Structure formats: structure tokens, C-alpha cells
Amino acid sequence: HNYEDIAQEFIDFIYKNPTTYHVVSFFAELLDKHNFKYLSEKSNWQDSIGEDGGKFYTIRNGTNLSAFILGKNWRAEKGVGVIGSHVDALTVKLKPVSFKDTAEGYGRIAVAPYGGTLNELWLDRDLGIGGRLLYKKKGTNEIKSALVDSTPLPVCRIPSLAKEDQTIPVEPPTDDEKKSPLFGKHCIHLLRYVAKLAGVEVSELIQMDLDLFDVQKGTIGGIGKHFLFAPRLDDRLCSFAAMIALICYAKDVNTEESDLFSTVTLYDNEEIGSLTRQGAKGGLLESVVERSSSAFTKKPVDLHTVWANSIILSADVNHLYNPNFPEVYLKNHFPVPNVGITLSLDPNGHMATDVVGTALVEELARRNGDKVQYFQIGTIGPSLASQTGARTIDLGIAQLSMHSIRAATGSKDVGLGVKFFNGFFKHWRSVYDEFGEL
Amino acid sequence: HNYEDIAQEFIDFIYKNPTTYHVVSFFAELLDKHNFKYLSEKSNWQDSIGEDGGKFYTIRNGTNLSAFILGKNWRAEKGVGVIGSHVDALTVKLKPVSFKDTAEGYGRIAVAPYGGTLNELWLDRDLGIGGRLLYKKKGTNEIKSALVDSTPLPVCRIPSLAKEDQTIPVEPPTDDEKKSPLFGKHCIHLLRYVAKLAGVEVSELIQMDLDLFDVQKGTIGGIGKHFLFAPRLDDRLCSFAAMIALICYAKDVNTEESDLFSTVTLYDNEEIGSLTRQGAKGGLLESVVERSSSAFTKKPVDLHTVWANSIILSADVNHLYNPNFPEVYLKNHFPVPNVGITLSLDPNGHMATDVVGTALVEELARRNGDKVQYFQIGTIGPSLASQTGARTIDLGIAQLSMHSIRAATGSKDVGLGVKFFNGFFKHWRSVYDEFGEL
Amino acid sequence: HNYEDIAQEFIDFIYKNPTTYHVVSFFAELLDKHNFKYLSEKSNWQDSIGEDGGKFYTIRNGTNLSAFILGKNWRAEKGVGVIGSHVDALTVKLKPVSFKDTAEGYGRIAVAPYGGTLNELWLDRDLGIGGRLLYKKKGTNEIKSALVDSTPLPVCRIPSLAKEDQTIPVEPPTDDEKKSPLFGKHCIHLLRYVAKLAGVEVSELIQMDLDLFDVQKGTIGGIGKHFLFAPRLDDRLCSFAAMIALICYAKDVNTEESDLFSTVTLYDNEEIGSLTRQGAKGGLLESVVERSSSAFTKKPVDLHTVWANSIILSADVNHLYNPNFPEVYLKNHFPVPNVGITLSLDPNGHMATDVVGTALVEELARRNGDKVQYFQIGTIGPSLASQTGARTIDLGIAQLSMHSIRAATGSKDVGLGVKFFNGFFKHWRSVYDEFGEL
């Protein structure tokens, strides 16, 4: 009510955090200012998690984040309430050696598509450069990370004609600059430019993982302002909604009076099939849960009983009804904007032969005043379901023109998404109890 | 000998138990009247399994069942004797919203194929409706399950012309009926009909997972009665044979005088690639074994040693020689009916480079008086083998016209299958001992 | 009213009488227990038909039957009320030499499709064997006929792969057995099997004309039981309805108080184009009428005047609206189930330019309380019309999936068909009188 924007907050979030690194870093800052404590995955957690439980988060690779709330009174039979989503998006990436010699004076860079064989939709769009630099300051032996972002400067673009065709229109090297490990691999100007943004010298740059992304800020749109146009909606839209839902929920939770175990886990490499250590199949969720339950109590914890009592919402976007292409959609099985969360059903696929998860989500929405929509036609749901043995439901916030460089969704859909996910954390355990043995 | 029918018992079993729900439920009743004890997967088993071991079974989702016999004197070095098979079959499923408005007075329903893009073989067949309903009785807060089956009434059929073409030819709503969660999603008549079968009100129906299946009862066939014609043979044929084998074997087992760990595990979603929590990759088998060995003894159990000493028969059907298509078959590598179990060999595939499993099965058959046949050309064998590290052999009972709505096999093949599997449980440990380190 | 089953009687009739031989034999038994007298076509009828007229039937080839009621007071100007239909159906036939040598131990038989190049619809269906055997008992010189039927035993099936491809999966010869004329032509087991069914020796078998047919019994179907699923509906459905109509009508007829000449004639070989001596072009109808009118009175009978005053209903099935394929059907010219008889209209074809027959059928239905449906898009109507000169109307009971091995129609359609045809015999003469010269 007037606070369904929130859509502006989302638009600012996509605009200010273009790469996966930025998104994870942004959530890290948001979590710890809500008193979630960072745990290194490289250290054992026995002495970091106690009888009281608490609020925590861990990070793998700077692109895979898990945030969790563990109750003082949690036990195996309570299970875990999980929302799983992905934070990688389709982009163009600077190649390891991005160096191209001039084409009639034009400066260019070797780049590769990430997550697809990219569209004509990427042509004639203003593209910023940004992501992660690795560097070693002089007279040190620590390799540190810096985040870099050219916004609002579009440093390049893939021109249409009015890795041969899709290429990009973008003084002498100092002795020190030649000492850099990246000297031959990237043109000196680009290196000088990223070095400037990070606040380090060119000679100190070890490596980089840079994207090219649309710098056009998102907008509320439509004559009645029913829509939201923005880049990278898949699946930063569900990720944002789930994380904000968890943090709003965490507000009213003293972990000492809780018997729940709740988590939002955000994965990398969904666009690539998820079979990486930062992806859904790398098992960060399962790692978090086993570690937490191990560190938390002296008693042994039966993980099979934990997962048998758990519910995983595998949150990934569905397709809005495109009124221009009615034939691809199935009648009575397509979502519309500004209504509510969409349940992905597929006759083949992991949720066929599981009517219970569908029923549970319907009951939740009923209790919380939400609406649910249907959509029948390396996704993380099947991976997580089979990896844990826990009942998993595929759903999400529907959008138009998915895997476009600029997608569309309802202007109320971020808020409705946060609302549904907030309701899930509050009620899933109670609602799942009445299915009993099922 | 006269008791190789058993084929009638099988025919009655397929006829009376059309969906996966019915099949699992049927086995649950058979097991517990043979004194197997049900364990909830949602409860820890420490205090349900003791020093004596025992006979048990557990169920996941109503479609994934594991039955096991744990010996009082079992130890890691004995391993597990496993038969793994699947109970899902190709069917048509009622869509989540099955509602179609009338086509010139004809009533119809939206349905989807499960496990394939379905055949012309499904045209002009009498189709019953059946499966699982979820319901909540009035003034309650328990969601219960009921099984429903229209047999012998064919409620519908997919007509040939003498999800556009393959669709199906099948008073006013009470206020109470409109109160049902499924009111808009399925036509009132269908809801009234399934409600009647379950013995509940329409208003009490929460959700349903219904199939459409062939109601034509199986028959012994051929002029010399050499064949068995029936629906859903893949892989309810191996599942039946393996379960009956285990139960016949269990008869002569006092668990107090046993040092063996035996199981038949039945999976869902093999036709869909097995990557679901109810499928082979959901790890019910491994869950059962870890839980049992944990609960059973105070000593710690090395699971790697258990699997290194185990044998898994991954039981799935092979192809009978179709004399009409000799060229697709490979000479000296095709099974015939009424001879015995068929070993699936594949030069690429998980049993290439493992001659030991083949040798073991041959030795077993030799000892038990069985015959073995060969067949070289998300299967569960590779999944289970890699998931456990245990030596796994793909084999099964061969059939004709697999993935037809009505398949064929030997009339003696159910009995021979039970015979072979019964021999396996009796002798595998002894036979595998002489391979020693291999 | 409660007696619109009648659908069960029809289902039992198709089930118990699989071949044309069985169907004709069945009608022969029904007719003569309703006091119709058999006339041999090989004997002159002068002294078998008298001044009183009577109820009669004759048979050609065991597959072509004519039943008629001749009134004592009949005259040329009264004409004949004719229903013409066919009793042959699409089947597979055993070839004259059905012998195939074993294919890896499998027994097989050479067969040919009758009436089409047969469907994938014939694959994986349980097939019985049955039809006519000719035999000569030992020390005799009479060649007799026996009917044979394996129902409910499916002796074979045409397998799908999971006259090359469509072929069929099915001790030493006695000296006497080698003496049979069919010894080399059919495998000894099949011959022994059919000999057993007939109650004769193998050595006594002269010849056989055997079909392979679906042994699946028909069912009432649909959630509201609106449908009838059964094999061989075309055109045993109209044949049954017409014959039962005649017999119900014959009940209230003393031939001594009648001035009508009524007949139902059932033809063979409609699926083959009708140009056989047992088909519509073999002229059994015309033969019956000329013979009867010759034998019946001493006065000469003008046959041209008889036919000029006659009405022939050429009863053959039309197509039900298949809601899955709306585009093949013509709006306002397609029948629905459980409504009534369907009039076949075709802008090209023999009923174009004859509006009078259509009008007469409409008037009949009006008088008898029937409903009439339309269907615009070697048929017997054109043959009979041109052969007699008599006004002929094409109509019938509509069905789905015609020329499938299992077709569908209304559950009320047999009864409505009998009702319409019964009304026709009662009123055609009276209704046709008001068209006068037309």
C-alpha cells in the first residue's frame, strides 16, 4: 500500500549492482547491517555457532551466497525452510586475453557470451564494463579483490550493420606497467582504466573477471504504470524478493525463541547448467545445513530426517502471457502481471507426480492472502530435490522477454514476491504439519 | 511347475493397481502382512531398529518405496544385496487445470503425456481415470490422501480421425462445491465423480494427481499360451518379480540368525530421467542403508566399506527379439521369451569395462539353475553405481513393444524373474566372496 | 426408456460373432426363431412362396443375407421398403498358404489386410482367430462348413517396435495329418488347433477362410456413460439396427393382412468396392424381389413399376464430429452422438439433385418422433439406386474413428437406430404416397 515501490528500490539495486560480484556484495552489506554474522567457509564453525543459534551468512567464490537463521530450539524434525534462487545473468564477458589489434584505428576487445548464443537484442545497447579485479599491492603477498564498475559510462557497444560479427567498438607502456601479469593479455588503455576505478596500479593487477552489461537504468512503465522495464531480471528478481523477505522476517525473530531453520541460498551458473562448485550442484545449501547442525548441538543430527521434513522453494522466473504470441501459451496455465507468484508445473520434469507441494503453496497463499498463478509449458529445483531428498516446489515471479537484455514484469510484482516469500518463512512449518506423513 | 502362474497374479496386480500410488500401496499391504514394519522417513529410526535387526519398509511421496531385511549379525564387510527398479510407467496425466469448455456439446479435459511424446498406440484405447486425491475433511486441519480408480469404467479416450489433436472426449454448482480449492480448475462433473469414489465431498478436495490409463485387463496369449499381453509392463514387471522374490526369501529368514542386509528399492520418475527426490538420484536406497546401519549398532559404520562389498541389480527391461525387425537387433545379443533374465550390455555405458558383474550373475544362475540372456544394443544403474561406488549390474526381463500402451513378454517370464531374483538374495554374498579383491 | 440397452445386446453380438460368417449365422438363428423361413437360393421358389406371402430369408456365400416380408395383398404399385447395409468389416486375413518358417524360434503366419492398407491402430491389440472351415468327414462325399472362434484366447498380435513389418507372433505330423489337403499350406499346430475347435480331424479339413480380429469386448464408456466403444462398428452397427428393427416390426405383422413388401439385405465386400457376387453389385436384393414376385402370383409383375414405387435406405455409417479436428468438418453439417440417424449428403455423389428422398426421411422422423442429422463432406447406395431405378437415400448411425480397430458411437445410438428403422418400415409407404408422381 504505497510501499509497493520497493520497485524503485529494486531498480536502484539492479542499476548499482551490475555483476554477480556486486549483487552478492550488496546482499552481504544488507545482511550484516541486519545483524547477520559472516562465517568463512574456509574455517570450521563449531566455535562460531552456539546453543542460541543465530543469524549468519557465508559466501563461496564471491558469487554464491547462503544466508540462514538457526533457532535455539531447532531440531531435525522441524526441517529447513529453503528458498533457492540464482544471481548469475546473461552477459558478455571479456575474454582472458581480450586483446585485438586496431581495425582501421578502431579499438576492440575479444569477448564471449555467457549463458547463451546471444541475441540481436544485444545490438546497439549502451554497455558498461565491470566486475572483479584481483590485485597484489606492491611489496605484499596478499591477493585481494576489488569491484569495478564504469556506470554510467558506456565504454562500448556491439553494432548492427545498417565471435566474428558480434564484436565491439571501444600513451606508451611504462616499465612498471610491463611488469604486470596482465600486460600482454589486455590493451594498456583498458588496464589503465580498470586500475583507475579500483584505485590501484596497473602493475598490481593479477587477474580480472569483467562483464559487459546494459547501463540503461530500469523504469516503471506503461500508461497506468503497470510495468517495470529493467535488465538482468532473470533471476535477480526472485533473488531480491527472497532476500528482502528473509530480512523482513528476521526483524521479528529472536533466535532464542525460535525452533526454525530458515535460509535463502543464491547460486551462480544456473544459465550454464548448474554443474559448478558455485552452482546448485556444488551443494552450498547442504553444506550450510550439515555444518550448522553439527556446530550447533553436541547431539548427533540425522540429516535425512531434516530433509524429509524440509520444503525448498526453487525460485526461478516463469513466462508472462505475451499477448502477441497466444499460441505458444497453454490456456488456463499462463500468468498475468501484478497478480502474484507463479507455480511452474511441467508434465515431464521433477514436480510431475508431486501434488503435495502444489497443495502446500496454495494453502500458504490462502493463509497469507496471496494469489497463486499456474504455468504449464540444469534447473536448480530438480538438482536440489534429488540432492537433499526434500520436497521441492518450482515457482517464481513471471516476466516477459526473458533472456532479453531488457525484460519486463509487473510494477507490483517485486512487492507481491516479497509478500509471498515473507509469508512462506512465517507459515510453511505450520502448513506442512497438516500434511503429516505425506 | 504349474505355479508359473503367478502370471495371473501379475495380471491381476497390474489390473487392480493402475497408478504408481496404487502399486506402492499394494506392496505396502503385501509387505506388512509378511511382517515387515513400516518406518516413517520423517522420524529418526534409532529406537525403531535394534540389535536384532528386522524386516522393514519406508515410503517417499507414495511413489518411492524401499523394503529391507537387516540381519542381527550384519557388518560393513558383508555389504548390501540390492535390487533397484522403477514403478512409474508411461501415462497421460490430468493437467493441474484440466478444464476445457465444451466443443459442440462434447466434454473434454486438458492432459499431458508423462514420460514421452505419446504414440498413435494410445489412440482408440479405453482409458480409466485414477490416482491420488488430497482432501481435508470438514472442521479438520489434516490433509489426508485417498486413492481413486474408475476401473472397469473407461471414462474417456483419445480418438483417431477416420496437445491439439491428442485431446479427449469425456447439475449446477452447489454453494459448498464452489468453496472447494479445485472449483475453477476442474469441471464440476469430474470433481463430483472423483469425490464419490473417494467417499468425500467436493468441498473437501484439496488437490489431485490423476492418470489416464488403459483399463483393458492383461491376458495370457498365443496359440500355445506362450505370451502375456498387458499394459504398464515397464517396469512394473521387474518391480513385481523383485518384490515377490524378496518376500519369498524373507519367509525363510529369521533376522536373528542372519548376517545379510537385503533390499528391493522401487523408484519413481525413471521415464523422466530420475533426477527427482523420488527418483534414483534422490538417494532413498543410500538413505535407508545409512539410517539402518546408524540406528542398528552403537559402533560406527564405514559406509564406503559397505558399498565396496555390495552388489546392486539395476533391474530394468530389455528388448525381446521382434522377428518382424531383425536388422535393429545384434546377432548373438538378443533375448527370446520364456528362457530367463536378460543382461543389458552396452559398449558405451556404465557396464563397459566391468566384466566382474557379468561373471557374478552367470555364476549365480549356474548355481541356482537359471538361464541368462544377453542384449547388446537417466537409467538408474549408472546413477546408483556412481552414487554408491558399489558394483552394479544392469539386467531385466525382456519384453516386446516397450513403451507401447500394451506390451508383451513370455508367460513364464514373471516366474523365471522371481526365480532368478530369489536365487540372487540367497547366493550373491557367497558367490561374490570368490571374486575376493576384484 | 431403460431399454436403450440394447447396447449390451449389441456389444454381446459383436463379441460373440467376430467374422461375417458368424454375423450372418447369428441373424439366421434370430430370423428363424421369429418364424422367418429359409429359402435356398439354389432352388426355385415357386412352390415355397404362395398366395399368403410370408416371412423369408435367403443366404449367398454365408456372407450375404436377405430377409423379407411379402404381403398377401402386395402389388407392383406398392413397391418395396428396403434397408441395405454391409456386414463385412476391416480385418486381417490368414493367407491361403499362411506358412512361415521359424524366426529364431518364433512362430508366424502370412496374413493380408482386408479392406485397407491397415493402421498403426492394429498394432499391439489382442487378436483372436476365427471364421469358416470347409471339411469332409471320413468316408463321405459332402463338403460341410463349420464356424470356428478362439475368443477369448488371443492367439496372436502384430507388434510395434519399441507384409514385412506387419507380421505376427503366434508334435510331429501324423500320417493321417499329411493326408489333409491343407498339410503344406498351414503349420500343423494351427491346423490342429482349428480342427479341435470345429470338432473334426486335421485330415478332414478341405479349406479355410479365417480372420484375425480384436478380442477386446466392447464397453459402455464416458463419465456419464454417453459412449459405446467396440470393434467392427462399420457397418455391423447399422446392420444390427436394421435387422432388429425388421424383426420388431415383423412381430405385429400377419402377412395375410399386409399389402407391403419389406426387406433388410446385408452385403459382403463393401470395403472392397462391392463388385463381387456377394456385394451390392451382385444383385441379391433384385434377385429376391424378382423371384418372390414371380413365385407369389400367377399374374405377371412389372418390376419397373415396383422399383419406381420403392424406397431404398442405403444404411452406412457417417462421421461423428471429432472435437479434436474441427477443420475437416463442415459447420451445420456434422452429427453429434445420442441424437439420431444421420443423412449423408454429398454435392457430388448420387443424392445430389434428389431433394425428395431427403424430404421423405424428414417427414418420417417427424411422424415417428425421431431426429435427423446432416453430414455434408463403391458405396452401395449409388449401386442399388442405378441397379433398381428406385429412389435411394444414404444415411446411417454416425461414429468416431471409423476404420479403426476400435470405434466409438453414442450409447443411445443403437436404440435410436432401431427406433428410426422400425418407424421406416411402419410408415414409408404412407409418407411416400403424398409425394405422388415425384
Author numbering:
A (entry chain A), B (entry chain A), C (entry chain A): 3 to 164, 177 to 184, 196 to 402, 410 to 470
Manuscript text:
When expressing S. cerevisiae mApe1 (sc‐mApe1) lacking the N‐terminal propeptide, we predominantly observed isolated dodecamers when imaged at identical protein concentration and buffer conditions, indicating that the propeptide stimulates the trans‐interactions between multiple prApe1 dodecamers. Due to the presence of smaller particles of putative mApe1 hexamers (white arrowheads), we stabilized and purified sc‐mApe1 using a GraFix gradient 29. Based on the twofold and threefold end‐on views from class average analysis, we determined a low‐resolution negative stain structure at 24 Å resolution by imposing tetrahedral symmetry (and EV1E). Class averages of sc‐mApe1 dodecamers including views of twofold and threefold symmetry. Fourier shell correlation of the EM reconstruction of the sc‐mApe1 dodecamer indicates a resolution of 24 Å. In the crystal, ct‐mApe1 is present as dodecamers, which are formed by two asymmetric units each containing six ct‐mApe1 molecules. The ct‐mApe1 X‐ray structure is compatible with the dimensions of the sc‐mApe1 EM projections and fits very well into the tetrahedral low‐resolution EM density. Comparison of twofold and threefold views (left and right) of the determined 24 Å resolution EM map of Saccharomyces cerevisiae mApe1 (sc‐mApe1) (upper row) with the simulated 24 Å resolution map of the ct‐mApe1 X‐ray crystal structure (lower row) shows very close visual agreement. A black sphere represents the N‐terminus where the propeptide would emanate from the dodecamer. Moreover, the geometric positioning of the N‐terminal propeptide on the surface of the dodecamer is consistent with our observed trans‐interactions of dodecamers leading to higher‐order assemblies.
The best‐characterized cargo component of the Cvt vesicle is the vacuolar aminopeptidase I (Ape1) 16. Ape1 is synthesized in the cytosol as a 55‐kDa zymogen that includes an N‐terminal propeptide (hereafter referred to as prApe1), which oligomerizes into a dodecamer 17, 18 and further assembles into larger aggregates in a propeptide‐dependent manner 19.
